[PDB]
């Protein structure tokens, strides 16, 4: 009788997608579409909080999972049996695309792989049967919530950094838009925040769909080759290409951390976003501390701006240093920042988007125009260095971005 609704609901909503994604990354097929869709429909489902038993919509989604998983498992089993009884062509293309794979007796993770995905699907189906038949019976908190919103903001930045391309270009655009809205210190409505979250979740689901369904061997073999114009532009990388007896790009750099980390990083990003959607010295001491902070915020941001000029080389960087010395040469340093904060923000954001364009997954598509030989910022051919340098760039541009926040706040105080 002591049926834990929350515990078993969390077990479902977390582990069954987990083993689901494991059996998926094992082998890609139409099982990708169906099975990843079964995972992603749940998203942030209405919790079973001891009310109205299992939700009607949740129950409908779960019974759809029953039907689809049972049909897929039975079909794969029947097709494998038929192949065994009977036995690179179009029939073989459909053979890979459906979910079947050739059986060979020489694999620890390969001979089992011939039937493991359907075994895992049947096990998940049985667990769902058991669970559905069994379930039918703040100040520090607010500070931590804002801190986790900030680290989700940083995670949006990081997942934009890991694959600079049109797959994450919209991520970076949403990042900059919400950052500028939050910088004006105008309280952004919870409706707009919910709309931004919904757009992020929808485009993330589309991103999973395209990245994985493109990871199917047939798609990259037939429709368009791996690392072609669209993969170089939008961003499409195939991770696993090893198959049964009839693996990405090249291994000149052994690490290749961003390329291998893209799936798991974006997956944990999805999980964090859906979870967030569901979720003495007296006053004189820190008042003087905050007074010093507001009197030296432009100074510290400008020193970080120099640090950017040290790390990165450009005639733009020359413009950065000349604007730095202009701002730090006069008596009205605070007033100078107060007046030219929008201009420096526009310049730095343009520099961000320009180095992003220069760090796109595209290579040799634009060539080496006059803005390269004369100016000279690296193309970032290796992504391992690119991810680190652009993460340094954003963590450095954070305070020079906050200076406009403080300037606007002060500005509407008078």
- Whose tokens are 């008078």? That residue is 414
Angle at 373 between CA 367 and CA 374, to 5 degrees: 135
d(CA 401, CA 396) in angstroms, rounded, equals 9
> Shortest distance, CB of residue 202 to other proteins, whole angstroms?
44
Q: How far is the CB of 83 from other proteins (least distance, A)?
A: 15
Enumerate residues 170-199 that contact other proteins by CB under 8 A: none
Of 51-59, 104-112, 241-249, 295-303: span binding other proteins (CB under 8 A): 104-112
CB of residue 131 to other proteins, shortest distance in Å: 22
Q: Which of 119/147 has CB closer to other proteins? A: 119
- For other proteins, which is the closer residue by CB, 102 or 197? 102
171 in Cβ contact with 156 (< 8 Å): yes
State the minimum distance, in angstroms, from the CB of residue 128 to other proteins. Answer: 24
93, 111, 122, 148: which one binds other proteins (CB under 8 A)? 111
Size of residue set near other proteins by CB under 8 A: 3
Options 87, 88, 105, 414; binder of other proteins; rule CB under 8 A: 105
Nearest C-alpha neighbor of 230 from the set 166, 160, 173: 166
Q: How far is CA 287 from the centre of its chain?
A: 39
Q: What is the DSSP string of 163-203?
A: S-SHHHHHHHHHHHHHHHHHHTT----HHHHHHHHHHHHHH
Q: Least distance to other proteins from the beta carbon of 111, Å?
A: 6
| Cβ atoms of residues 24 and 31 within 8 Å | yes
Complex with other proteins: residue 106 or 138, whichever CB lies closer: 106
Please report how close the Cβ of residue 220 comes to other proteins at its closest, in angstroms: 30
* Nearer of residues 105 and 191 to other proteins, judged by Cβ: 105
Q: Does 245 bind other proteins (CB under 8 A)?
A: no
Q: Report residue 188 as tokens.
A: 């952004």
Q: With CB under 8 A as the contact rule, which of the stretches 48-56, 103-111, 245-253, 277-285 interacts with other proteins?
A: 103-111
Q: How many Å apart are CA 259 and CA 162, to the nearest integer?
A: 8
For the CB of residue 109, give the shortest distance to other proteins in the complex, in Å.
Answer: 14
Evaluate whether 376 touches 314 at the Cβ level (below 8 Å). yes
Cβ proximity of 348 and 397 under 8 Å: yes
Q: Which is nearer to other proteins, 106 or 280 (CB)?
A: 106
Shortest reach from residue 82's CB to other proteins, in Å: 18
Residue (111 or 324) nearer to other proteins, CB: 111
**Under 8 Å between Cβ of 265 and 159:** yes
CA nearest 200: which of 178, 183, 219? 178
Closer CB to other proteins, residue 107 or residue 225?
Answer: 107
Q: With respect to other proteins, which residue has the nearer C-beta, 108 or 283?
A: 108
Task: Name every residue whose Cβ is closer than 8 Å to that of residue 118 and which is 6 or more positions away in sequence.
Answer: 72, 73, 76, 77, 99
Instruction: Determine the Cα angle at 156 with ends 191 and 349, to 5°.
Output: 95
Chain residues binding other proteins by CB under 8 A are: 105-106, 111
């Amino acid at each position: 009788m002591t049926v834990p609704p929350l515990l078993k609901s969390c077990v479902v909503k977390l582990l069954l997608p987990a083993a689901l994604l494991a059996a998926a990354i094992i082998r890609p097929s139409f099982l990708s579409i169906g099975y990843v869709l079964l995972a992603l429909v749940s998203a942030v489902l209405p919790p079973i909080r001891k009310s109205l038993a299992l939700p009607k919509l949740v129950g409908t989604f779960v019974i759809i999972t029953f039907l689809f998983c049972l049909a897929v498992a039975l079909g794969v089993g029947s097709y494998q049996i038929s192949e065994q009884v009977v036995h690179n062509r179009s029939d073989t293309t459909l053979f890979r695309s459906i979910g079947l794979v050739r059986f060979h007796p020489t694999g620890t993770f390969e001979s089992t792989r011939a039937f493991l995905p359907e075994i895992i699907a049947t096990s998940a189906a049985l667990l769902t049967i058991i669970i559905v038949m069994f379930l039918s019976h703040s100040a520090i908190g607010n500070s931590l919530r804002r801190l986790t919103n900030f680290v989700l903001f940083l995670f949006t930045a990081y997942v934009g950094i890991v694959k600079p391309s049109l797959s994450n270009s919209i991520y970076f655009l949403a990042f900059l838009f919400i950052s500028t809205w939050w910088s004006t210190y105008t309280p952004l409505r919870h409706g707009v925040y919910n709309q931004i979250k919904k757009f992020l979740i929808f485009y993330s689901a589309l991103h999973f769909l395209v990245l994985y369904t493109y990871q199917i061997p047939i798609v990259h073999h037939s429709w368009l080759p791996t690392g072609s114009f669209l993969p170089r532009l939008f961003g499409l990388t195939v991770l696993m290409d090893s198959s049964c007896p009839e693996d990405f790009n090249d291994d000149d750099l052994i690490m290749k951390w961003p390329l291998y980390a893209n799936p798991i990083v974006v997956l944990v990003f999805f999980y964090l976003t859906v979870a967030q959607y569901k979720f003495s010295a007296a006053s004189k001491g820190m008042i003087a501390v905050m007074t010093f902070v507001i009197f030296h915020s432009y100074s510290i941001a400008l020193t970080a701006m120099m640090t950017w000029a040290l790390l990165y080389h450009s005639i733009f960087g020359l413009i950065l240093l000349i604007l730095t010395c202009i701002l730090w040469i006069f008596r009205d340093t605070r007033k100078s920042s107060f007046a030219m904060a929008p201009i420096i923000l526009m310049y730095i954001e343009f520099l961000l988007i320009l180095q992003y364009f220069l760090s796109m997954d595209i290579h040799a598509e634009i060539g080496d125009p006059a803005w390269m030989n004369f100016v000279g910022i690296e193309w970032t051919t290796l992504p391992v260095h690119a991810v680190i340098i652009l993460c340094v760039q954003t963590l450095l541009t954070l305070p020079v971005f906050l200076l406009l926040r403080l300037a606007r706040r002060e500005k509407f105080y008078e």
